[PDB]
Amino acid sequence: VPISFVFNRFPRMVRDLAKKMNKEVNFIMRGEDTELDRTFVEEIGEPLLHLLRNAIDHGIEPKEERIAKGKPPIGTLILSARHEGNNVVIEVEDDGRGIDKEKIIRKAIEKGLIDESKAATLSDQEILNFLFVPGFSGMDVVKNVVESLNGSISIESEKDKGTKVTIRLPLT
Ligand SMILES: Nc1ncc2ccccc2n1
Numbered sequence: 001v002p003i004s005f006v007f008n009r010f011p012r013m014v015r016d017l018a019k020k021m022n023k024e025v026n027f028i029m030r031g032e033d034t035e036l037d038r039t040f041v042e043e044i045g046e047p048l049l050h051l052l053r054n055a056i057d058h059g060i061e062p063k064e065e066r067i068a069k070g071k072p073p074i075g076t077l078i079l080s081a082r083h084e085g086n087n088v089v090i091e092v093e094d095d096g097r098g099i100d101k102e103k104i105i106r107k108a109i110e111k112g113l114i115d116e117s118k119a120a121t122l123s124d125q126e127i128l129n130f131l132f133v134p135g136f137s138g139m140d141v142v143k144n145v146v147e148s149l150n151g152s153i154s155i156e157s158e159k160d161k162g163t164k165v166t167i168r169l170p171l172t
Helices: 010-021 045-059 063-068 100-112 124-132 139-148
Strands: 026-032 076-084 087-094 153-157 162-169
Touching: 010 026, 010 045, 045 076, 045 087, 045 139, 045 162, 100 124, 124 139, 124 153, 139 153
Parallel strands: 026 076
Antiparallel strands: 076 087, 087 162, 153 162
């Protein structure tokens, strides 16, 4: 099917969550005509809804805070799909407050998953990959579904700039 069968549900879910959270959100959908196998279409909805929720709750800041930080007042959330070879790539991007890598390291140390000495040299991707650890605090459940579809997921984020989650699905 076109992924529009999934993506057409999201503007409703996104305004509803924005109203509940007192966030002003500019939601943009691109690539909705991108076609993929029915099994992916019937399963990819729940993971995507989780990522959109995360963007609106934890990423986009309220307008007053964005103005105070010198950002464009209304936060933007972009959900896109495209073909890459025989794969489909789906991205959820926001221009919100990002993921705080220092907080992740602190939590990791508190949980005994790494010591201070080793935290100093972790890469960005190694740090963000703690988010997929079960119970870390979720992104594990999103990963579980994606992996069940033989997909991969990655996260890029920077503090104050925003977050991009990318899901790559096979042709299957
Ligand atoms: N999009 C987004 N933005 C901030 C987050 C902060 C914590 C965890 C997930 C997040 N995801």
